[PDB]
A paper describes a structure:
Here we describe the two-component-like orphan [name] [name] (Repressor of iron transport Regulator) as the archetype of a novel family of peroxide-sensing transcription factors in the pneumococcus and related species. [name] contains an Aspartate-less Receiver (ALR) REC-like domain, which retains the common (α/β) fold of canonical REC versions, yet lacks “invariant” residues in its catalytic pocket required for typical phosphotransfer, including the phospho-accepting Asp residue crucial for the histidine kinase-[name] phosphorelay.. Here we show that [name] regulates pneumococcal iron homeostasis in response to cellular peroxide concentrations through its single Cys (Cys128) located within the linker domain of the protein. Atomic structures of [name] in its oxidized and reduced states demonstrate a dramatic mechanism of activation that hinges on the helical unraveling and subsequent formation of an inter-protomer disulfide bridge to enable DNA binding and transcriptional regulation of Piu.
Residue numbers in the entry: 2 to 125, 134 to 190, 192 to 230
């Protein structure tokens, strides 16, 4: 059912991951170059794109930016060595739904992919202040400009906007990282990223930190 685009620079690992993911009944398209991966992701809606930090002909960050122009909520996961991921950690957190270290254990990869899919599917209010949300296409517009929220950022905004009450970090973790089974610090990171996308200098932020409680949407 679900469709995976896979670009892995280690050939034997690429072949192993392709075969093992197909045993889970995923359709897997293996590609060797970033330019080809981008052309395919532009024409097909993949449920997961699994890449290294560097695709060879371009960085994953560059791939993700180019894809985001038309598919901003694309679901990208990064598999790489610890050193390579940590060298690009802030960048990766800002475009990738998740990351996983080499050497990979296949049972762990399979479990994490399943959780990511189920957290998106469960998720899958149309205005707030100057924002308009297109829930069918997972797109957000602040005025006549598209705001290129990532999948995680979109899911976080939808959770905040869908709740009349203030939400704790633990509630936001359970909604936006559903099925992934504990550290709420990640919520604070993605709140920071989301504010960076939505907020206008000299306006009140779109997100209020509520003392002793959590986060909620904020009026102008």
């Amino acid at each position: 059912g679900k469709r995976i685009l896979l670009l892995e620079k280690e050939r034997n690992l690429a072949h192993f991951l392709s075969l093992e993911l197909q045993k889970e009944q995923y359709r897997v398209d293996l590609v060797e170059e970033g330019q080809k991966a981008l052309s395919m992701a532009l024409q097909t809606d993949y449920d997961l794109i699994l890449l290294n930090v560097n695709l060879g002909d371009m960085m994953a960050q560059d791939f993700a930016e180019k894809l985001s122009r038309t598919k901003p909520a694309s679901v990208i996961m990064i598999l790489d060595h610890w050193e390579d991921l940590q060298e690009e950690l802030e960048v990766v957190q800002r475009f990738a739904v998740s990351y996983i270290y080499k050497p990979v254990l296949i049972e762990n990869l399979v479990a994490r992919i399943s959780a990511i899919f189920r957290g998106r599917d469960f998720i899958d209010p149309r205005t707030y202040r100057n924002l308009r949300i297109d829930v069918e296409h997972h797109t957000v517009y602040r005025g006549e400009e598209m705001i290129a929220l990532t999948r995680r950022e979109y899911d976080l905004l939808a959770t905040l906007m869908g709740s009349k009450k203030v939400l704790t970090r633990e509630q936001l973790l359970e909604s936006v990282w559903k099925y992934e089974s504990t550290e709420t610090n990640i919520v604070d990171v993605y709140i920071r990223y989301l504010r960076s996308k939505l907020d206008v200098k000299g306006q009140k932020s779109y997100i209020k930190t509520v003392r002793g409680v959590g986060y909620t949407m904020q009026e102008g």
